[PDB]
Design a protein around this nucleic acid. Structure first.
Ligand SMILES: [Cl-]
Ligand SMILES: [Cl-]
Ligand SMILES: [K+]
Ligand SMILES: [Mg+2]
Ligand SMILES: [Mg+2]
Ligand SMILES: [Mg+2]
Ligand SMILES: [Mg+2]
Ligand SMILES: [Mg+2]
Ligand SMILES: [Mg+2]
Ligand SMILES: [Mg+2]
Ligand SMILES: [Mg+2]
Ligand SMILES: [Mg+2]
Ligand SMILES: [Mg+2]
Ligand SMILES: [Mg+2]
Ligand code: NA
Ligand code: NA
Ligand code: NA
Ligand code: NA
Ligand code: NA
Ligand code: NA
Ligand code: NA
Ligand code: NA
Ligand code: NA
Ligand code: NA
Ligand code: NA
Ligand code: NA
Ligand code: NA
Lengths: 56, 81, 194, 46, 65
RNA sequence: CGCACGGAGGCGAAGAACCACAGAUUUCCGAAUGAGAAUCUCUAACAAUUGCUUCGCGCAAUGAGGAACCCCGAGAACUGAAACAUCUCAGUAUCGGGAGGAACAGAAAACGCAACGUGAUGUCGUUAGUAACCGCGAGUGAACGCGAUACAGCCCAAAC
RNA sequence: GAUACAGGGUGACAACCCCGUACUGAAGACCAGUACGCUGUGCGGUAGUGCCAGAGUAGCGGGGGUUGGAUAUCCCUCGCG
RNA sequence: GCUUUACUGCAGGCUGUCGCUGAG
């Protein structure tokens, strides 16, 4: 079975959803963790220095 | 503080319920229960509510189908507002 | 004449001799069964505690903390590394055990602030330190001329920023002359070479 | 699928946002809904 | 417009409540006429009713009901 | 009568609009704290960790945010050495913890132009690419002092 | 006209058409709960007295990290003291 | 990327020693 088009047919699973804390469609309903703001994993907001250039 | 009744839902279907089934239709607050809708309606229009049916509409509001007792006449209550 | 306190001090100069030795051998048995951070009503070394700022007053807290002995509990590299950076066994942390103990205590009492701490011995696998914490919100302390300084906003989380006595010594701030070129006024301002 | 009351409110809002700029706004501003979303061609969140 | 601040402060605690219910009713009836697509409206009032209600509630808070 | 110049209608000399200050209101989720949940729901709530304690959540604290700055920890590699291992990139990137309006430092168990001398601490200029390090290769790299800025000096433990 | 010829607007190049601009004045914020002033306390000196003065510390050894720190940086860890 | 009696190191295992650690 082709890994491309034919394998795209079984994709009817809901994972990432609108997050209660940040509003982004990143709250993984299976993990109960927002991949965008960190909701469900940490009280503090998810943020990294690598999200921008080093001297900025 | 939020009020229970928002306004009368007046559409062709609502008229049929009023003329043929003695029912009044309202746009109510989505946090309101059938009982709270029954009460509010009785106090605002001075009638006897027999049954309340609800629905959370695709308009983001709640619709309540309130049936009045045979003592009251839906057409008359509606005609005065 | 000699204070009674001088006797507690003198006993602790040699914790492996005399009555103190027998005391420690008995105590540690109970300590090893206690948790990570145990609040204790009275300091084990009264002289040392008072010398460091302790007072038998409201809002003054003392707690004994046990921390494992030895080097860094380190994980081996999981990617490319030059030989120099491939070590695991001989690497030791830059913060001394006493400082680790102080942080563990402060975390246990979030509203309190670390005033100071001291050692109360060790066995073969762990060390114990008693930390003196203070309630910056209690009026018995806000009115104390000798302790009220710890109530100021800039003293919040002082232990976590190395403002403790053990913090300052461990940061290489003891000396005011030769050897402190990269420590004062801060390790960070000196490029982290202290 | 089974929609919750909250999901339903959001779908309702998206449908409402999908209306056109009223005729009078055109006259008032002396002369486009940049958020026109088709159910088939576009994809909503969640 | 028609209902001024002085008149509201001159009312008794009970008069404001009764006046509030009166205003709420005029509002509900206007929203009902509006829902029925009824045009005998006067857009200024439905807007004035909201402000009058806000004013009464503001004064009720000021005077301790 | 916002952007916004329509239509209808309305508000303003009972001084509106508008601006400043102060106050009122301020749904739900959110550190999110009664419990659960993709912003809803279920049957009185400082959840959790702590201090005091009338030992009752009675009185309090912490949590999270913020452009970067700041302090304390963890800590690469590409690269340079025309290869490469120490060295270098660099205590850099990135990660963990935390404060403030600024941090940190700070009244000598100092300095050591060795003196009949200086006199808390930052910082700026200089000292100087000097001393020192280094397959003594490539590279690395201060300080005292001096000229400035600003200046401020005190509290315990113990004795009695 | 000008203690105002900065700048902008206005149907084309504007000191004098309008806003402004010079001069004078006012308010808020910051400096700062600081300086000054004041209330209280009481500085200091001689002689005698081995009464007091911070311990796993000072210091040494093993193993590391770090630094310009070289025998002579700072720190960690285990042992001794 | 992979290999090995290539160079140099790093985990891990075995083993002595010190601390925990005491009486005859
Ligand atoms: Cl602290
Ligand atoms: Cl000098
Ligand atoms: K390298
Ligand atoms: Mg594939
Ligand atoms: Mg239903
Ligand atoms: Mg600095
Ligand atoms: Mg539609
Ligand atoms: Mg909750
Ligand atoms: Mg090279
Ligand atoms: Mg070479
Ligand atoms: Mg370097
Ligand atoms: Mg020097
Ligand atoms: Mg005193
Ligand atoms: Mg190095
Ligand atoms: Na409606
Ligand atoms: Na704390
Ligand atoms: Na779709
Ligand atoms: Na508000
Ligand atoms: Na609280
Ligand atoms: Na309680
Ligand atoms: Na090269
Ligand atoms: Na190469
Ligand atoms: Na080298
Ligand atoms: Na000179
Ligand atoms: Na160093
Ligand atoms: Na050592
Ligand atoms: Na390959």
């Amino acid at each position: 079975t082709g890994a491309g088009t034919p394998s795209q047919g079984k994709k009817n699973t809901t994972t990432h959803t609108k997050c209660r804390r940040c509003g982004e469609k990143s709250y993984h309903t299976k993990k109960k963790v927002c991949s965008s703001c960190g909701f469900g994993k940490s009280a503090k907001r998810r943020d990294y220095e690598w999200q921008s250039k080093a001297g900025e | 503080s939020w009020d229970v009744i928002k306004h009368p839902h007046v559409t062709e279907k609502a008229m049929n319920d009023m003329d043929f089934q003695n029912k009044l239709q309202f746009a109510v607050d989505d946090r309101a229960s059938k009982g709270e809708v029954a009460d509010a309606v009785e106090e605002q229009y001075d009638v006897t509510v027999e049954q309340v049916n609800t629905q959370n509409t695709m308009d983001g509001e709640k619709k309540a189908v309130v049936r009045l007792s045979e003592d009251d006449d839906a057409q008359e209550v509606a005609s005065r507002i | 004449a000699r204070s009674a306190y001088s006797y507690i001090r003198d006993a602790w100069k040699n914790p492996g001799d005399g009555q103190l030795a027998e005391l420690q051998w008995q105590r540690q048995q109970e300590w090893r069964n206690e948790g990570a951070v145990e609040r204790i009503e009275r300091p084990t070394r009264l002289d040392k505690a008072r010398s460091q700022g302790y007072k038998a007053k409201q809002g003054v807290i003392v707690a004994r903390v046990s921390v494992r002995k030895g080097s860094a509990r380190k994980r081996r590299h999981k990617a490319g590394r030059r030989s120099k950076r491939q070590g695991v066994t001989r690497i030791t942390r830059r913060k001394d055990i006493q400082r680790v103990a102080e942080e563990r205590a402060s975390r246990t009492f979030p509203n309190l602030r670390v005033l100071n701490s001291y050692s109360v011995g060790q066995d073969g696998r762990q060390k114990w330190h008693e930390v003196i914490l203070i309630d910056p919100n209690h009026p018995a302390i806000q009115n104390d001329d000798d302790l009220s300084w710890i109530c100021a906003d800039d003293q919040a989380d002082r232990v976590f920023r190395g403002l403790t006595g053990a913090g300052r010594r461990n940061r290489g701030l003891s000396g005011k002359g030769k050897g402190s070129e990269k420590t004062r006024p801060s390790l960070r301002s000196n490029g982290g070479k202290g | 699928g089974k929609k919750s009351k909250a999901t339903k409110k959001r779908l309702a809002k998206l449908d409402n946002q999908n209306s056109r700029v009223p005729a009078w706004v055109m006259l008032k501003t002396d002369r486009r809904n940049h958020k026109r979303r088709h159910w088939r061609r576009n994809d909503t969140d969640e | 417009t028609v209902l001024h601040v002085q008149e509201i402060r001159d009312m008794t605690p009970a008069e404001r409540e009764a006046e509030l219910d009166d205003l709420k009713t005029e509002l509900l009836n206007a929203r009902a006429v509006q829902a029925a697509g009824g045009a005998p409206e006067n857009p200024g009032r439905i807007k004035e009713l909201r402000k009058a209600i806000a004013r009464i509630k503001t004064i009720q808070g000021e005077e301790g009901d």
